[PDB]
Structure 1
Amino acid sequence: LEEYFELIDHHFELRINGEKLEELLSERAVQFRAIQRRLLTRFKDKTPA
């Protein structure tokens, strides 16, 4: 019950790290989508810029 809890805690630390990495990937993907939409708007436009 004590060398068994440390493995549980390692597992849960990895889980929490994964959730953090995923919520960061969400923000990065949102940024990429926003900049991509801006670029698409610049593409559809006729006038140079």
Structure 2
Amino acid sequence: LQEYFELIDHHFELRINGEKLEELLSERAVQFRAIQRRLLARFKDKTPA
């Protein structure tokens, strides 16, 4: 049960690093959806874009 307690932690820290690599992609996808909406507001076939 002591040796069992080592494996439950580094799995949970890998879940914590699993909970750490997820929020950085989401806001950059929010940055990725904002730049598409900046395109479609701009992308038209004339001069000022």
TM-score using structure 1 length: 0.80
C-alpha RMSD of the superposition:
1.6
Percent same amino acid at aligned positions? 96
Deviation at 1:31, TM superposition (A): 0.3
After superposing on structure 2, the runs of 4+ consecutive aligned residues of structure 1 that deviate more than 6 Å are none
Structure 1: where are the runs of 5+ without partners?
none
Aligned length: 49
Unaligned runs of 5+ in 2: none
Q: Once structures 1 and 2 are overlaid, which stretch shifts more, 39-48 or 23-32?
A: 39-48
Query: What's the TM-score, normalizing by structure 2?
Result: 0.80
